[PDB]
Design an enzyme around this catalytic site. Sequence first.
Site, PDB file in Angstrom:
ATOM      1  N   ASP A 195     -12.528 -27.082 -15.107  1.00  0.00           N
ATOM      2  CA  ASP A 195     -12.573 -26.367 -13.874  1.00  0.00           C
ATOM      3  C   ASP A 195     -13.737 -26.942 -13.147  1.00  0.00           C
ATOM      4  OD1 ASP A 195     -12.392 -24.567 -11.696  1.00  0.00           O
ATOM      5  OD2 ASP A 195     -13.566 -22.931 -12.849  1.00  0.00           O
ATOM      6  N   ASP A 243     -20.501 -24.549 -15.475  1.00  0.00           N
ATOM      7  CA  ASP A 243     -19.614 -23.806 -15.704  1.00  0.00           C
ATOM      8  C   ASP A 243     -18.775 -24.395 -17.116  1.00  0.00           C
ATOM      9  OD1 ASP A 243     -17.457 -22.037 -15.664  1.00  0.00           O
ATOM     10  OD2 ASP A 243     -16.162 -23.120 -13.972  1.00  0.00           O
ATOM     11  N   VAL A 254     -25.149 -12.788 -13.167  1.00  0.00           N
ATOM     12  CA  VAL A 254     -26.281 -13.789 -13.283  1.00  0.00           C
ATOM     13  C   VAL A 254     -27.662 -13.299 -12.696  1.00  0.00           C
ATOM     14  CG1 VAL A 254     -27.249 -16.062 -13.613  1.00  0.00           C
ATOM     15  CG2 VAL A 254     -24.782 -15.563 -13.206  1.00  0.00           C
ATOM     16  N   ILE A 303     -28.291 -13.259  -8.907  1.00  0.00           N
ATOM     17  CA  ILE A 303     -27.996 -14.600  -8.054  1.00  0.00           C
ATOM     18  C   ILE A 303     -26.503 -14.955  -8.420  1.00  0.00           C
ATOM     19  CG2 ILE A 303     -30.520 -15.083  -8.557  1.00  0.00           C
ATOM     20  CD1 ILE A 303     -30.008 -16.454 -10.883  1.00  0.00           C
ATOM     21  N   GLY A 304     -25.820 -14.090  -9.326  1.00  0.00           N
ATOM     22  CA  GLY A 304     -24.384 -14.726  -9.749  1.00  0.00           C
ATOM     23  C   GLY A 304     -23.643 -13.518 -10.066  1.00  0.00           C
ATOM     24  N   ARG A 305     -22.219 -13.619 -10.014  1.00  0.00           N
ATOM     25  CA  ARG A 305     -21.515 -12.793 -10.496  1.00  0.00           C
ATOM     26  C   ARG A 305     -20.071 -13.312 -10.971  1.00  0.00           C
ATOM     27  NH1 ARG A 305     -23.220  -8.134  -7.820  1.00  0.00           N
ATOM     28  NH2 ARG A 305     -24.619  -8.463  -6.206  1.00  0.00           N
ATOM     29  N   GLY A 306     -20.160 -13.435 -12.671  1.00  0.00           N
ATOM     30  CA  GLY A 306     -18.985 -13.841 -13.050  1.00  0.00           C
ATOM     31  C   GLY A 306     -18.067 -12.777 -13.403  1.00  0.00           C
ATOM     32  N   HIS A 307     -16.737 -13.145 -13.909  1.00  0.00           N
ATOM     33  CA  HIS A 307     -15.897 -11.945 -14.587  1.00  0.00           C
ATOM     34  C   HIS A 307     -16.540 -11.481 -15.732  1.00  0.00           C
ATOM     35  CE1 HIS A 307     -11.944  -9.843 -15.026  1.00  0.00           C
ATOM     36  NE2 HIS A 307     -12.107 -10.139 -16.277  1.00  0.00           N
ATOM     37  N   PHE A 308     -17.251 -12.143 -16.728  1.00  0.00           N
ATOM     38  CA  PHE A 308     -17.822 -11.700 -18.025  1.00  0.00           C
ATOM     39  C   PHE A 308     -19.022 -11.049 -17.523  1.00  0.00           C
ATOM     40  CE2 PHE A 308     -15.453 -15.806 -19.353  1.00  0.00           C
ATOM     41  CZ  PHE A 308     -14.171 -15.302 -19.678  1.00  0.00           C
ATOM     42  N   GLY A 309     -19.510 -11.093 -16.506  1.00  0.00           N
ATOM     43  CA  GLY A 309     -21.035 -10.670 -16.499  1.00  0.00           C
ATOM     44  C   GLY A 309     -21.558 -11.152 -15.260  1.00  0.00           C
ATOM     45  N   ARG A 336     -18.346 -25.586  -6.269  1.00  0.00           N
ATOM     46  CA  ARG A 336     -18.691 -24.482  -6.488  1.00  0.00           C
ATOM     47  C   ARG A 336     -19.300 -24.171  -7.981  1.00  0.00           C
ATOM     48  NH1 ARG A 336     -13.110 -23.668  -6.258  1.00  0.00           N
ATOM     49  NH2 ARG A 336     -12.220 -23.558  -8.677  1.00  0.00           N
ATOM     50  N   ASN A 337     -18.989 -25.128  -8.934  1.00  0.00           N
ATOM     51  CA  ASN A 337     -19.360 -25.041 -10.483  1.00  0.00           C
ATOM     52  C   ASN A 337     -20.247 -26.300 -10.741  1.00  0.00           C
ATOM     53  OD1 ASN A 337     -17.468 -22.878 -11.134  1.00  0.00           O
ATOM     54  ND2 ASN A 337     -15.660 -24.210 -11.165  1.00  0.00           N
TER      55      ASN A 337
HETATM   56  C1  LIG Z   1     -23.776 -17.190  -4.067  1.00  0.00           C
HETATM   57  N1  LIG Z   1     -23.834 -17.981  -5.325  1.00  0.00           N
HETATM   58  C2  LIG Z   1     -22.606 -17.709  -5.954  1.00  0.00           C
HETATM   59  O1  LIG Z   1     -21.828 -16.944  -5.731  1.00  0.00           O
HETATM   60  C3  LIG Z   1     -22.379 -18.280  -7.165  1.00  0.00           C
HETATM   61  C4  LIG Z   1     -23.283 -18.320  -8.242  1.00  0.00           C
HETATM   62  C5  LIG Z   1     -23.516 -19.174  -9.175  1.00  0.00           C
HETATM   63  C6  LIG Z   1     -22.510 -19.943  -9.520  1.00  0.00           C
HETATM   64  C7  LIG Z   1     -22.368 -20.742 -10.780  1.00  0.00           C
HETATM   65  C8  LIG Z   1     -21.897 -21.772 -11.002  1.00  0.00           C
HETATM   66  C9  LIG Z   1     -21.786 -22.179 -12.145  1.00  0.00           C
HETATM   67  C10 LIG Z   1     -22.541 -21.659 -13.236  1.00  0.00           C
HETATM   68  O2  LIG Z   1     -22.769 -22.395 -14.401  1.00  0.00           O
HETATM   69  N2  LIG Z   1     -23.129 -20.571 -12.957  1.00  0.00           N
HETATM   70  C11 LIG Z   1     -24.015 -19.587 -13.733  1.00  0.00           C
HETATM   71  C12 LIG Z   1     -25.120 -20.275 -14.290  1.00  0.00           C
HETATM   72  C13 LIG Z   1     -26.176 -20.385 -13.299  1.00  0.00           C
HETATM   73  C14 LIG Z   1     -27.321 -21.024 -13.860  1.00  0.00           C
HETATM   74  C15 LIG Z   1     -28.453 -21.347 -13.168  1.00  0.00           C
HETATM   75  C16 LIG Z   1     -28.548 -20.816 -11.764  1.00  0.00           C
HETATM   76  N3  LIG Z   1     -29.613 -20.817 -11.158  1.00  0.00           N
HETATM   77  C17 LIG Z   1     -29.675 -20.321  -9.800  1.00  0.00           C
HETATM   78  C18 LIG Z   1     -28.718 -19.575  -9.211  1.00  0.00           C
HETATM   79  C19 LIG Z   1     -28.853 -19.345  -8.144  1.00  0.00           C
HETATM   80  C20 LIG Z   1     -27.799 -18.765  -7.169  1.00  0.00           C
HETATM   81  N4  LIG Z   1     -28.248 -18.395  -6.024  1.00  0.00           N
HETATM   82  N5  LIG Z   1     -29.629 -19.091  -6.048  1.00  0.00           N
HETATM   83  C21 LIG Z   1     -30.527 -19.079  -5.035  1.00  0.00           C
HETATM   84  C22 LIG Z   1     -29.858 -19.530  -7.129  1.00  0.00           C
HETATM   85  C23 LIG Z   1     -27.461 -19.469 -10.116  1.00  0.00           C
HETATM   86  C24 LIG Z   1     -27.476 -19.964 -11.380  1.00  0.00           C
HETATM   87  C25 LIG Z   1     -26.346 -19.882 -12.006  1.00  0.00           C
HETATM   88  N6  LIG Z   1     -23.151 -20.044 -11.910  1.00  0.00           N
HETATM   89  C26 LIG Z   1     -21.349 -19.992  -8.650  1.00  0.00           C
HETATM   90  C27 LIG Z   1     -21.323 -19.273  -7.430  1.00  0.00           C
HETATM   91  C28 LIG Z   1     -20.078 -19.757  -6.560  1.00  0.00           C
HETATM   92  F1  LIG Z   1     -19.695 -20.560  -6.811  1.00  0.00           F
HETATM   93  F2  LIG Z   1     -19.588 -18.468  -6.572  1.00  0.00           F
HETATM   94  F3  LIG Z   1     -20.813 -19.409  -5.342  1.00  0.00           F
END
Ligand SMILES: CNC(=O)c1ccc(-c2ccc(=O)n(CCc3ccc4ncc(-c5cnn(C)c5)cc4c3)n2)cc1C(F)(F)F
Length: 281
Positions: free
Chosen positions: A141, A159, A32, A24-30, A145-146
Amino acid sequence: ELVQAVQHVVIGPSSLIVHFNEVIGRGHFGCVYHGTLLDNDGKKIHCAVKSLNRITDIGEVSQFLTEGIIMKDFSHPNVLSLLGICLRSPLVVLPYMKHGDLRNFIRNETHNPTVKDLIGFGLQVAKGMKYLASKKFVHRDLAARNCMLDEKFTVKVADFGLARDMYDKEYYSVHNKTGAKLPVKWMALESLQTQKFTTKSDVWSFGVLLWELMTRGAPPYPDVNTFDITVYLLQGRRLLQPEYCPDPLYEVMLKCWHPKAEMRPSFSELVSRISAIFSTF
Ligand SMILES: CNC(=O)c1ccc(-c2ccc(=O)n(CCc3ccc4ncc(-c5cnn(C)c5)cc4c3)n2)cc1C(F)(F)F
């Protein structure tokens, strides 16, 4: 390893299952992942699992943990909480936000947020930022998006702490001496010049966040390259008023972008002005 005040939030590996197949997410450190966590009361809850498996160094992960563990003491409805950390790849367990990041929600065509929904989202971000500033916490930051949006349309400022990462590489510049990752088009003018950040620089970013909400996720300064941004701001030029942004709300953003950091409103003053705009019209 060293002090063990993190044992207050340690989660047993048998109490957490990480669905590695669902990113559900992709950070630089890893990445999600979707996660299933059993509470202390034995209830199964949805959760997100952020891994830090890309930082492999005993000292560097220890500094990140102790720098980030402060989020366990934070508690506010508009600030993302820490469910715990799983030591096994030091995993960070966070509450699952149904609608993901705030900017992707408002950019989605199939969603129909009203002008009042968008204003209320910004008021929630202001409320969360007012809490963090009260604890003297600088959120270097702040951007749409955050921030996250959960099941009850409650915006959580995220974030930060153990959740800090670059989740969208496009908008960051990596300073090539320090390690600093700089969101160029969200930073205050004085931050672009000196690379130090205060609560007043957070207010500047909050104005850009507000502008993001009223454009429903448009990228700021689309015709200004990342070099010309500092001169563009030094000439007094600012982000223009969105078509469906109320005049009193645009004036709030203009206050956030004043050249002098002491001129900008506190987050407490922002909460008052936005809540007044939210209750009228
Ligand atoms: C396509 N999404 C992304 O690329 C994406 C994904 C995550 C983040 C982002 C921003 C701040 C943050 O702290 N965390 C990590 C922590 C975190 C915690 C609970 C979450 N619960 C649901 C989802 C999530 C992502 N999808 N769904 C349908 C649900 C992401 C989560 C992410 N993640 C940011 C983006 C981004 F900005 F870049 F857009």
